[PDB]
């Protein structure tokens, strides 16, 4: 009885369901769906004072499922919750679709990692892809959940749209000085090195191929069934040893490195965001904020970044958070003497 | 012949590091670049970056940090002028005007062109296919766009990428303020390329790692299952393929591996080509998408969008960079 | 092309007429092109 359903879900179809597909397909379909519902139809006028739908007039770059109203706090904003009282429209005007999307997305991400584990167990391979997927989930939980929980409200989370993310990026520089954050520097290093490794390994394989065909199109020199290497690891090791000084000699270590580099970068950036939830910032170097203030001649690129951050902060915040009602007169706004 | 012995030794695949004819140009260019960079990053005096007699202190002995040190770009008073060690009056106005940056840059750019040629050289001397230089041409295009092409397009070597961590961050912010690169589609492609190359790197590595053939015990590294030069395939393409296909759908997983590694090459290389090109067209002031004042209400009032909020932050950056150096309200290139 | 002859039309026209009749603006509380400035950020939680 109970075994029949297990045998059902483990079947070979066009899309594998599995047991994880109960916690993945009902959530992901909602989260993805609530984005398309949001970015087509609902406004951010009552949460943000901005327009963020195709119905407003926005395009794909400037639509978002923006974060909830700043007065909603860290409320879950359930549809039946007190802030909507079951009323659908009042739930969409206060940014309840952001919480719908974010919660269904984190459950979809859990369901997808469970799916990766389940399919590895069914087929019988190691679960390294789920381990590698723990880095996007660490980043998702840091950016969309841990950061707004550490802040005032869900409002300061990232909106589910392109330009909302661009605002989030510039907000993080101006208010957080996030480029100066070393955990983010390791994140950048990990991601850039992951892209370097991807490119260099693909081109190295493609240029150390064996003559396993007769045509000039070398893409037909490989069969799925063959048990032999399609590219010379010896020639590749020789080339990179005499170009770069070092080379891989172990194929398994190479492909573990290709796993390890972007995953650990992405995890280190998640650590940096976890720090920015509590405002624990690598904002400044105390020695240089001191020296530049005892010496009106000491200019470094860092001091010019601190000035740029103040310029961003004062010239964004009056329309970034409109619940705060920041009033800055034109003559306290830091200008650079236009 | 002594000369034939020299050409045998240069083009020799016996050397620990291959030299070749691109390397006989590359090695002195790196010698100068490395020498002047290690010299200037530590001990260069402050540089008059924007030509207004406001020295910017960029070196590690002038009270400055590994994060915040930089070989400071060449003075705006110089512009694109050739300013070597000998055209200056002394060795202290050359240091003051940012000559070290120009010397490092003018040897670093040809050294990378020669490193690319050297990669082709060694591919030719070893009988392997010649296109690792093509993959390397993407970071080279990216580093020439921010060291040569943007200064040429803007008119000064002071608009070049500073040779420092915080200088690089400053370059990013000023570039966003002046060009809105985030709304540039070539930069969205570059971001897709770097993030998707990281995705695909992690993905390909986890798949090859996950479907490894059992050769070892549990108390020894799986990397001992591979022997350098072994002919047998060290992983199971079939098992990784079946897993990936069950993960998404049937006609999605690369069965082929030559196509697979061409895609691994092609995705971040092509996207970094495009983002280097984006820096290069913004060098001629062809900036990103502009959607300010684009959604209007019935009367004509501008309804703010998220692009408006990004503008408002970019204007924040815009009216604070090079503060004592814009005498007119229109900062042209 | 038989059982879907009108099925694809009826659905597409349904979405078109959902926007065109103005039901979308009332469906999601979206401000119409003249309800923006007759600006109201909601300032309270339990009663928006």
């Amino acid at each position: 009885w109970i075994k029949q359903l297990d045998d059902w879900l483990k079947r070979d179809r066009f899309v594998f369901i599995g047991w994880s597909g109960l916690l993945l397909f009902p959530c992901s379909f909602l989260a993805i769906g609530a984005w398309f519902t949001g970015t087509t139809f609902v406004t951010s006028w009552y949460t943000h004072g901005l327009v963020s739908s195709y119905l407003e007039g926005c395009n794909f770059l400037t639509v978002a499922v923006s974060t909830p109203a700043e007065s909603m706090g860290h409320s879950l904003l359930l549809l039946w919750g007190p802030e909507a009282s079951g009323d659908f429209v009042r739930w969409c005007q206060i940014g309840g679709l952001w919480t719908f999307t974010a919660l269904h997305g984190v459950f979809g991400l859990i369901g997808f990692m469970l799916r990766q584990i389940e399919i590895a167990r069914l087929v019988g391979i190691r679960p390294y892809n789920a381990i590698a997927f723990s880095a996007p989930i660490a980043v998702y939980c840091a950016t969309f959940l841990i950061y707004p929980l550490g802040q005032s409200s869900w409002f300061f989370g990232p909106g589910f749209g392109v330009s909302a993310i661009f605002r989030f990026l510039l907000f993080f520089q101006g208010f957080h000085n996030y480029t100066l954050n070393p955990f983010h520097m390791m994140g950048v290093t990990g991601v850039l090195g992951g892209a370097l490794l991807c490119a260099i390994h693909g081109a190295t394989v493609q240029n150390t191929l064996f003559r396993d065909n007769q045509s000039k199109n070398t893409f037909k020199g490989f069969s799925t069934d063959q048990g032999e290497e399609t590219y010379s690891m010896v020639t590749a090791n020789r080339f990179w040893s005499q170009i770069f000084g070092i080379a891989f000699s172990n194929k398994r270590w190479l492909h573990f490195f290709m796993l390890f580099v972007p995953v650990t970068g992405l995890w280190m950036s998640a650590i940096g965001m976890a720090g920015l939830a509590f405002n624990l910032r690598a904002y400044d170097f105390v020695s240089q904020e001191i020296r530049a203030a005892e010496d009106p001649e000491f200019e470094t690129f860092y001091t010019k970044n601190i000035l740029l951050n103040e310029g961003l902060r004062a010239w964004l915040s009056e329309m970034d958070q409109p619940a705060k009602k920041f009033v800055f007169p034109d003559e306290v706004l830091p200008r650079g003497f236009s | 012949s002594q000369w034939e012995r020299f050409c045998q030794w240069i083009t020799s695949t016996e050397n620990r590091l291959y030299i070749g004819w691109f390397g006989v140009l590359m090695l002195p260019l790196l010698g100068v670049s490395i020498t002047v960079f290690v010299t200037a990053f530590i001990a260069a005096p402050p540089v008059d970056i924007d030509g207004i007699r406001e020295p910017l202190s960029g070196s590690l002995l002038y009270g400055n940090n590994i994060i915040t040190a930089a070989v400071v770009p060449t003075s705006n008073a110089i512009g694109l002028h050739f300013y070597p060690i000998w055209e200056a009056a002394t060795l202290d106005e050359w240091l003051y005007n940012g000559g070290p940056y120009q010397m490092i840059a003018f040897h670093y750019i040809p050294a990378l062109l020669c490193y690319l040629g050297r990669e082709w050289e060694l591919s030719y001397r070893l009988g392997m296919r010649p296109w690792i230089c093509i993959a390397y041409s993407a970071p080279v295009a990216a580093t020439i766009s921010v060291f040569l092409i943007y200064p040429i397009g803007q008119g000064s070597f002071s608009d070049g990428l500073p040779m420092g961590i915080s200088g690089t961050f400053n370059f990013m912010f000023v570039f966003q303020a002046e060009h809105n690169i985030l709304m540039h589609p070539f930069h969205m492609l570059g971001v897709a390329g770097v993030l998707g190359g990281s995705l695909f790197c992690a993905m390909h590595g986890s798949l090859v790692t996950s479907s490894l053939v059992r050769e070892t015990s549990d108390s020894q590294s799986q990397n001992e299952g591979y022997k350098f030069g072994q002919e047998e395939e060290t992983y199971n393409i079939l098992a990784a393929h079946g897993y990936f296909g069950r993960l998404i759908f049937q006609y999605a997983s690369f069965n082929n591996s030559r196509q697979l590694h061409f895609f691994l090459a092609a995705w971040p290389v092509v996207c970094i080509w495009f983002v280097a090109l984006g820096i290069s067209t913004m060098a001629f002031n062809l900036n990103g998408f502009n959607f300010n004042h684009s959604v209007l209400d019935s009367q004509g009032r501008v309804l703010p969008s998220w692009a408006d909020v990004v503008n408002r932050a970019s204007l924040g950056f815009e009216v604070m960079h090079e503060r004592n150096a814009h005498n007119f309200p229109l900062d042209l290139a | 092309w038989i059982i879907h002859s009108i099925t694809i039309p009826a659905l597409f026209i349904a979405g078109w007429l959902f926007v065109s009749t103005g039901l979308a603006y009332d469906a999601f509380g979206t401000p119409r092109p003249n309800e923006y400035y007759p600006l109201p950020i909601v300032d309270d939680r339990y009663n928006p």
């Binding site: 769906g33 087509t40 119905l55 007039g57 | - | 597409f12 959902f18 065109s20």
Partner: peptide
């Protein structure tokens, strides 16, 4: 009514509706 008929329609019965709505939005005068 099968599994094939639901995993190709729950994604596409809404999608055509959305596309029809968005095609109508290209003709809205605001």
């Amino acid at each position: 009514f099968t599994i094939r008929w639901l995993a190709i329609h729950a994604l596409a019965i809404p999608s055509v509706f959305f596309l029809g709505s968005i095609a109508a939005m290209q003709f809205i005068q605001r």
